[PDB]
Every structure is written in C-alpha cells, then in structure tokens.
Design an enzyme around this catalytic site. Structure first.
Site, PDB file in Angstrom:
ATOM      1  N   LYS A   5       0.152   5.506   5.956  1.00  0.00           N
ATOM      2  CA  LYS A   5      -1.206   5.573   5.092  1.00  0.00           C
ATOM      3  C   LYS A   5      -1.009   6.901   5.306  1.00  0.00           C
ATOM      4  O   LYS A   5      -2.808   7.184   4.686  1.00  0.00           O
ATOM      5  CB  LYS A   5      -2.401   4.595   5.231  1.00  0.00           C
ATOM      6  CG  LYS A   5      -2.035   3.237   4.990  1.00  0.00           C
ATOM      7  CD  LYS A   5      -3.551   2.361   5.277  1.00  0.00           C
ATOM      8  CE  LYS A   5      -2.962   0.663   6.198  1.00  0.00           C
ATOM      9  NZ  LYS A   5      -4.077   1.059   7.632  1.00  0.00           N
ATOM     10  N   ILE A  27       0.764  -1.467  -0.394  1.00  0.00           N
ATOM     11  CA  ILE A  27       0.156  -0.098   0.026  1.00  0.00           C
ATOM     12  C   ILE A  27       1.274   0.845  -0.019  1.00  0.00           C
ATOM     13  O   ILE A  27       1.207   2.345  -0.580  1.00  0.00           O
ATOM     14  CB  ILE A  27      -0.593   0.135   0.671  1.00  0.00           C
ATOM     15  CG1 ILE A  27      -1.842   1.188   1.144  1.00  0.00           C
ATOM     16  CG2 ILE A  27      -0.664   0.129   2.534  1.00  0.00           C
ATOM     17  CD1 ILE A  27      -3.206   1.634  -0.021  1.00  0.00           C
ATOM     18  N   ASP A  28       2.279   1.326   0.603  1.00  0.00           N
ATOM     19  CA  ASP A  28       3.072   2.294   0.870  1.00  0.00           C
ATOM     20  C   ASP A  28       3.774   2.388   1.230  1.00  0.00           C
ATOM     21  O   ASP A  28       4.502   0.781   1.495  1.00  0.00           O
ATOM     22  CB  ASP A  28       1.960   3.500   1.426  1.00  0.00           C
ATOM     23  CG  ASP A  28       1.963   3.505   3.185  1.00  0.00           C
ATOM     24  OD1 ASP A  28       1.974   2.238   3.427  1.00  0.00           O
ATOM     25  OD2 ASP A  28       2.281   4.091   3.972  1.00  0.00           O
ATOM     26  N   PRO A  29       5.020   3.211   1.633  1.00  0.00           N
ATOM     27  CA  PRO A  29       6.749   2.481   1.847  1.00  0.00           C
ATOM     28  C   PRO A  29       6.496   2.606   3.088  1.00  0.00           C
ATOM     29  O   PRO A  29       5.709   2.313   3.708  1.00  0.00           O
ATOM     30  CB  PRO A  29       7.288   3.880   1.785  1.00  0.00           C
ATOM     31  CG  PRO A  29       6.686   4.332   0.551  1.00  0.00           C
ATOM     32  CD  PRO A  29       4.936   4.722   0.693  1.00  0.00           C
TER      33      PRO A  29
END
Lengths: 227, 221
Positions: A140, A76-78
């Site tokens: 997020k 979803i994200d880093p």
C-alpha cells in the site's frame, strides 16, 4: 483459427513518463483521457523507486475486455515483490494469496491435483489490483499516487460487472471509491488471513448464487486451475 | 530502468537526449557524429538540426515493427519519420489510404505512424539537404548502420519502403531478422501491393507469437 489477429479492439495513448505508451482494450476508452492526465501528474513520484510490478507492466490489465466480465475479484495492490501486472498471478505458484485462493476453489470443486491457479484465465472474471503498483516490499506504499486513478478505474469496472468481490476488510477501509450506481459487493477476508477457511471458501461460493439472482451465468472457478 | 539520458556533441544540436534503450550505441554515435557534423550542418536540412535525433526518445523495448523510409521528407521534416502535422505529404497520405482500405476506417483528418503501439517509424538517414532526397547518405552512413542494427535487435519485423531507395544500403545486421522490402508509398499504381504489404506484417508477427499491430491507432480524427 483462420482469421489473422489485427488488434482492431486495441487502442493506445501516450503518456509523459515510462511506460510512455499505454495500450488498452476499447472497453476502457471512456476513462483513458482522464487516466492520462492523472498519470502524467503523478508518474514522477511513482517511478522514483523500484516497484512491483515494473512500470512496463503497470497497465497491462487494461488489455482485458470488460463487456464479457461479470465478476471482479479485487485486492488492494500488487504483491510486494514479483508482481507481473496480472493481479494475483504467481507464475511459479509461490505467493500465499493465490495458493490460498486455489485451496478454496479446490475445496469447493473437488479438484485435488493441480500445479497452479490463475484468476485471469476464467471466463467472466476480471482480477483487479485497486492500486496498480507498490514500492518494492512495502504494501500500500503507493496509495497516495494511484488514489484518483484507482477510483476512476474501479468505478468503470463496476459499470460492467454484476458482482464485485473485495479481499481484505482492513485493506479496503477508507478507499472512498465513489461508485456511480451501487453494485452487488462482497467485502471478504484477505486470502492470506489466518483461521477463516470456512468464510473464505463460502465467499467464493456465494458469488455464483448472487449471479443467478441477477440472471447471469455462473463462474466456473475450476477454469483457473493450471495442470 | 526506463528514462531519458543525455550526451553532448561538439556541433549543433550540442546535446542529444535519448531513451535508455539506446544507451549501447550512444558513445559510438557521438564519435561518428563529431566526425561528420561540420560537413553536415553546412546546408539547410530537413529536419532542422535540433530535431535530428528526437526519435531516439522512443523506447525500443515496446517496439515489434520498424517501418523505415530512406531519409526525411525533402521539406518540413519534423524529426518524426513520416510525420506531417498538416497532413499534406504524399507518403503519409498514401499510407493512410492503405490503412483506410485495410481497416475500413472511412473518415479521418490525418495519420501518424508514431502513435501506434509496437511501431517505431524510422528514417534510415536522419537528414537530407533541403529539397534533395538522399543528399546526406555519405554523412549518415556509419550512424545509419549503427542505429538500424540496434533497432532490429528489438523489433520482430523490419519493413523498408522503397525498393530502389534501399538498394545497396549494405547495413548488414548482426543477426538476420524478418524483413520486407516494399514499394515507396508514393509509387504509382501498386495499390494492391502497398495495401497487402501492411496486411502481412501481422501474419509475420503471429508466426513470431507477437501481438498484432492495430494500424488504425495511427488515424487522427
């Protein structure tokens, strides 16, 4: 060996805020003018805080070709900290997600000894972060800024890959990425999720089955091991 | 961080906005510029004083090649070195032709060194008296050394155009860096050396394990 690199497939665009210049493989050219518009709209809000990764590493995955990619492995994200700009990459091999992914591939291949694992050095795999940054330490937290850019980039990826593998059933709720055509997709568990070793192992296994149905070459996941 | 800062000077342009990568030289630059500005702004200049320093808005952290001419165009300088919006100046058309011959790009309407990842184009002296090349060497002297020294701490290759232009520049760097002194872009009958001087920059970058320059990123279609 013999040819001197001259970056002939590498383009660049200017944006109004850091990192000021985005360089990208030619394969991404259809989306870059839209990306520039979106990023200039939102960059101010993004750059207010310390981010993972640093702004100079936001877009380095765009240097990756897409025409030789048949699997996208997407989180979803880093990482909340120490993101490098390469999704899932952990140079000192400390992040729980890539350790769990390596354990899965170790159980699938029988490779026992290794010092690291990197999804970014596997022929045919593009590892991907849906959101390209997060506020340092808060997962997020930059969803609202990346929103339209993230849809644009994932939509472009799925025109090239045959299999999209999303990690995190909760994480990928409500993203609303409008794909242009349906693509073979697996939504599996988060790599750091608890007590689902079997389904995590088996999710990687099915990808190569899915590729052969598509008459595509399998992934050699063992290519990711660092010795 | 990566963002714009600002300093005030006593004379026009009164305010200098700059990328934070330049912060280490800005207080010395202010001191130097206040010393010389009055003598400088007497003449009409290329570029205008409001555009003297706009190239300081470039980051250096993402720069690995400096392409350096001696001073701005005698006329119509924009503050961006080598830049010619209507593609009329001889040097950039000659550079563009070299790149065209190197890359095989046939059709284009213009060329700008300032839109190439990894390249910072640069003017050693940041102004000239209008119509007269090298007219402001005396005024920019110490500043020009200060800024070029700072650039070569970031870039891997320094490419100076004009063998006579750069004779006795004496800019003496804190640490040597890979440098190449080629011919002036408008020089006569040296196409092979002009074309080749660009080509070998990527060879040098490879030696340094740096990413190549795609010179074709400069074309404007």
């Amino acid at each position: 060996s013999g040819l001197v690199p001259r970056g002939s497939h590498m383009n660049s665009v200017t944006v109004s805020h850091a990192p000021y210049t985005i360089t990208y493989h030619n394969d991404w050219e259809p989306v870059m003018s839209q990306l520039v518009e979106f990023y200039n709209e939102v960059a101010s809000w993004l750059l207010r805080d310390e981010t993972s990764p640093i702004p100079d590493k936001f877009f380095i995955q765009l240097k990756q070709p897409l025409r030789n990619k048949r699997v996208c492995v997407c989180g979803i994200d880093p990482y909340p900290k120490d993101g490098t700009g390469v999704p899932f990459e952990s140079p000192n091999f400390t992040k729980k997600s890539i350790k769990e992914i390596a354990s899965s591939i170790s159980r699938l291949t029988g490779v026992i000894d290794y010092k690291g694992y990197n999804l970014n050095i596997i022929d045919g795999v593009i590892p991907w972060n849906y959101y390209l940054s997060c506020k340092l330490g808060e997962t997020k937290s930059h969803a609202i800024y990346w929103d339209k850019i993230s849809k644009l980039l994932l939509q472009h990826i799925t025109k090239h890959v045959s299999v999209l593998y999303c990690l995190g059933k909760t994480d990928f709720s409500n993203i609303r990425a409008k794909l242009e055509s349906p693509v073979t997709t697996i939504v599996g568990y988060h790599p750091a999720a608890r007590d689902r070793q079997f389904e995590k192992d088996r999710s990687f296994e099915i990808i190569n089955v899915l590729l052969e149905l598509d008459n595509k070459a399998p992934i050699n996941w063992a290519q990711g091991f660092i010795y």
